[PDB]
């Protein structure tokens, strides 16, 4: 069975709380529950962690070594700032896909910079929660080739 | 009225599957497009396609989409880094689009980080190979099916 | 021998008057051009026109102007930011030109501040809408009428 | 009747004095007299001020508030340097057109920078004194729509 | 009754411990205690947290949602580095004022960059502890309108 | 030479316009009202306060020069000149009277060019974005520092 | 099997010999090409040529060279500074090339220092006028004659 | 307060992974082995050595704060934090304990972003690219300087 | 008889008033008076203006047209900021030498930028008051050829 | 008879010594001997100097004044660093062609910068030793026009 | 028997001559002599050259080809400027360690740039003369494996 | 050790060419003529003057080193080396002899790369664009400063 770790970075716990009539009502719990149902349908063992702590995400990545086939990560703000997270992913050598709900290129210029996009298998941005669904499909498709 | 989606492919994508296939892969552009057509039929969506090495042909296609096209899926290839004219065609016609790249364009030269399209796209998918077209189509139909 | 002026319009300008007219305005490119033709006739000047989304077509037009054209009026649209080839066509044929933009291109994205044409133009008019073409034509004829 | 203020910035009083056989014989007084005749023909009330003093231009702009429909300004060197002039124009909220006699993009790279061009209705450069004539036509055309 | 949250970032626990004959004797606990007294006089409930941990500041901000009217924050070094902190503040939509004890424009050029100043109501720097007093007054003045 | 502190308030270009631009959406408070309020506050603190607003860079420089030997602290809202005037910076450095820089609006929430300043690095401190209250706080800060 | 070399000339090079010949020189593009053809015949090499102002035409020519062309000689003119699509055509077909400029493009505007081709070229010759084409051809044939 | 020097060794994020990534091509030496070797060296020099490795920026900052009044020198391999942590820089500046910065690999032979550091300019010195031996040399350097 | 105009920019009126035991006692009036005497010995008529106002310097330059052979200018802070001053000098086409008392390359990096140095005949910096003496000699030497 | 000076800069004496099975076996002595034979065939008087010393190259250039018609120079690393060499060439006003064996644009970004390319008649890079042959042909062709 | 070449760049001959009560008394000859003794204890033959001439350093490197196992170099100012020195080292393919006595990141920003650090085995800075001792130990440790 | 001042004049690369390039349009004055004139001026001021011109960076560095303990001031026209030689900067800093930088031409009126210098920030002052007279003035400046 394939084992996939879903990581959500800082502030994603707030999803669906800020002016939802403007920004959307979907919550992180709903996205995760949706992806668990999908993974179960594909015979994937999915694990999840959301954290506002950089160290907790790094620890999860370290703990994945030897037992996890792929990482799906929405790094949120840490994609722009965390060399430590980059080095955690590089150190464990588990492939990953980077996911952003919104289009991060349509915002401040500082959000164009990433310490993860260049080492990711790929990146999905701007497609909302569907991005997680697609990333999971892509991971399973890849793992199924070899 | 079923949705109509226009798939645009930019320069050099006609070469897919021809450079060192045992190394880079065998999938051709015609295979990708024909698969996407059958996926679209399954979603009860009409799909038109154009691949061109000519910036003007892509621009003309975008202009011609006015009033008959609900969404654009575009793999702009090298034109994403260079074509303000394509950006302005897309803005001019006001049809939403998703930008697709087969490879991870952030893992190559620094100049490929710059785009005249990524900021005005609904979203972007890179590095997932041909599947990125399937996901972009699903994304488009999901978005259209809400509104 | 009356003066002959070539009016060139670049990419996407064929869309004028079609995007949200109550917001952006109703004037079309054909209306602007037909008005400029009648203005030119009044000044006893011959006026030729080409609009194209193809860089090569604009370049070919500039080449073809050699020996028959006294001045060029060009709204290069997005190509002003990207086309060194157009710059080099203009320098190659040595026909003076004025650069025209309908909108104030300094009030939009920072990338639109860069031009490969503005430094070699006689002058530049931006932000005055269609009137900018009328003023550019008057400017050209005034300059030709001195020399 | 429409009321239009023409402002000329520093050094424009020297027009027609420097190597005129090379640079031109037209003087500022001639341009202004030409524009006054034109404005009178259009039924526009035209006022003028040329100054080498930034504060005098700002004061003129402040004094225009409530009585002036449009500003035509050749800011000369101040277009590259004066945030105060920008803020005067923004503060009084009178639309303006920026005029330069010469093509300022054909000179030093520092002359490409402007604190006015982005907030102007439009800009005319490189057409010599005719630029003022066209700017006045444009202003009247605009004012005549609404 | 207004509720205001005072957040202090990394290293501010060291205030008054480094060469005080040179840098001053005022400690963080003194500043906070003095501010609490000022708040009581203004009918404001003042909560406080100092932390060297980015996540603890983010968590405090999240926990302020629905019960806090204004945030006063001295982000210290995180103002230059934390997009996550910026996004916490944007996400909860509680207005805030940024406070620095020293003039952070008089130091290294890297200190000129901030991920918070552009989204703050305002910024006060270089005025020492009084900056907190002024920020608190500003906050109450704004909430009272 | 008295024992009473004397503070000079300087206001730069365009600040005379305060309260005239879209009053309903920006406020009706005028510069005259801000200064008169600050004069009352200063009286209450038993401190002398002088004021000058000018659109002329040289007038502000001359005021700074004329403050030598009679002014304990300068409060300055330089407005647009903070981004452009090396001459004002050098006037303040030349006179060695401490100052606080004040902006009504948050200048970091505007164009990127407004992030640059020739004064903020040599000021005792900076207050921005707090409206007229920033003048009140800067005066309190000045008096508090002088009273040490 | 003799070697086959494709000579590509980019935009505005059709104007060679026409701008102020007493100042800039009289040699035309057709003269250069016809001389290079006779040089190629002497080296027992087949030489094909295309000059175009259209980026797409150059790209199509490069694509069409696959499987029949041993080396490409290209004077890209202004496209060297702007065309990522041409870079990607060359990389896509994996035919080695030499970049040729008639004039010293480092002695003009700073923007002409940037190239999307010079880093992937076997080499570059600039500033030697028409002779640069002769040298590039000799270089190509020498390289092919070793391997 | 003793006469014996006390040195604090700090190891930043991901250094716990040492010896786990492609061992045949990168080596089998673990962080535990490096620290135990350094403890033996320190014993031999009659110096006390404390160690902490953490993936948490705050844990390293807290360790630095807790070193006040008991630590003569800090040896730090900050790993990725050297490029990003102004907070660590300010912890070290706040405590005023001298330190040496250590990197196992040559960080200048990697991505250009790794050339930037918030620590290298305030360190006594920097050692990079010499593998585990860099820790040995940094400890020798520290003791040599303290012994002056 | 050559006529030379000496222009002094903003804040130079303060020369000799700030910590003179440290920065020196030489005042602007002393420098100008000494230079006047030197000029008299060289058969030069020397005119002078110091101003904190950009427009006053520009006006002086304009007024020099047709009656002034050379300009010696210590532009002070305006060298870094005034395109208008550059254009006044270009417009009147009177050659000039730029003088700074201190070494303006030994200070903030912003002081390295100038709108005048590239169009000056030459520049003298860091030599104190002597720089004016040398500039005057240079000017006369050039006019005498 | 035309007189041409060939200058080779630092490290070019190592040619053919570093991993020749990978980088090539051609030595500097062979290139120079090849060019001497070529020059003799063209009736050109060729002089050569290779040096690792910037001053020696500058001195050679100074000594060429009045007796040398053209300079062929492979400046090696000095093209990126030596303003003095640029000023030597400018000072003596002898035209030159710049030659690099390898394609210097395919290496580190710092190698794109040159203090010589902009004042050279032309530049040849990436064609190996043939580059010297072509440069000599170009020089003779030029000299033969006038 | 390993052979190691120690190269010292420009101005290092001045070590110990400028304000020694402030900057220290250790001279280059003392450092080299001490290192020679250390080398003898490690069965290493140590050769040395200090030069203010770029070409002399380049020549020494070229002459090391085939007889030298490792290079220890304190390039001084040339680390920031000499592409030629970089290419000499690359050309001869002898591994090297870069040594600086002072912390060159604590000085002007221009000193952060190097044409050697990225191709060195490693770099040691700011540790004074000990840096040479450590570099020598590192070199021997690496050659002994 | 005498009471007479000793000044060292250094001329950098290519300055030996003075007077040879297009004489009719650039002038016929040679370096030899400039130096001989400066020697006469120095004699007149009762000051000793030594001179060296070299195209070799190391020769200039060695001259600077050899000036230690015998030279009161250095006058240097570094020519192209001002833009490139950190080594010369460090020689001058190492010897702590004050210097003035001299350029015959206005180097700010040329290519932008000539605006950068490794010497101008550590020089007492700089004179450019005044031709040979710049050497005369720099010598006067040096003697005037030493005479204080």
Curated annotation (Swiss-Prot), chains A, D, J:
SUPFAM superfamilies with a match to the protein in the record: Type II 3-dehydroquinate dehydratase
Site positions (Transition state stabilizer): 18
Pathway: Metabolic intermediate biosynthesis; chorismate biosynthesis; chorismate from D-erythrose 4-phosphate and phosphoenolpyruvate: step 3/7
Molecular function as annotated in GO: 3-dehydroquinate dehydratase activity
Protein origin, superkingdom: Bacteria
Alphabetic keyword roster: Amino-acid biosynthesis, Aromatic amino acid biosynthesis, Lyase
Stored Pfam families: DHquinase_II (PF01220)
Location of the active site: 23 (proton acceptor), 100 (proton donor)
Family matches, as CDD domains: DHQase_II (cd00466)
Residues that bind substrate: 74, 80, 87, 101-102, 111
GO biological process annotation, one example: chorismate biosynthetic process
The enzyme's E.C. designation: 4.2.1.10
UniProt enzyme class: lyase
Family membership noted in the UniProt record: Belongs to the type-II 3-dehydroquinase family.
Name of the protein: 3-dehydroquinate dehydratase
UniProt organism field: Yersinia pestis
Gene: aroQ
